[PDB]
Design an enzyme around this catalytic site. Sequence first.
Site: not given
Length: 254
Positions: A115, A120
């Site tokens: 990942e 974010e």
Amino acid sequence: NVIWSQEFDGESLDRNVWSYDVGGHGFGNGQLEFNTDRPENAYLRDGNLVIEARREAYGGNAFTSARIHTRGRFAFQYGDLEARIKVPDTSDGIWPAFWMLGNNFPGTVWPKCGEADILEIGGKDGIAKGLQNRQINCALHFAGVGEQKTSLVEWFDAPVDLHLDYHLYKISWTPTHMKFFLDGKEFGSWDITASEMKEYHQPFYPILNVAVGSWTHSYTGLDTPEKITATLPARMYVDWIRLYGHPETKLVQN
């Protein structure tokens, strides 16, 4: 040198590029939103992709949104992937993300697939410190030493509230490193030549979503509908996403 892009020009999202993660089961983080394949939650307009989270009773959940990816239609290994995004006011509760998974997912389970989180925002530490639309992170989650979940996270505090305008969120991915940028300025970097990080030498595909809430111990710290105080509907505008090729770039299309 753009070798792949989505300019979001049409009036509907191209299903020969994109797929919808559908469900409202929390997605391993206690998220409250039900991600749907509906025009309400994901749609094109004036040269933009708009993912819209809404306070709305749906499928057992109190919120709808969308969570889209290009797995099976587009993946790449090495390159600069950049997206021009205006994130919504995350206030308290909203958790938008621009990120990637290894192209062997979900055959290879998480986090062995690998990942890379490019953007974010809307984290609990940001709320506490009063930096809701300033404090972002990039991250690497993978199977490291002993095949165990390893998380590398770099935090950055943007000079300006990022919900007021479009900003450029980028990864530069070479055989030696992964680097993350806000408006061309690096705020995260990791060497990926280590033996336990071989998962970052395969194709990856991008993902875009707008989550609402999470377990208290997860990203937002807000785990019930009543604790979500953010303005809804909340809209993430994506003007484009482009792949700037490297010599070493491997492109996967079908």
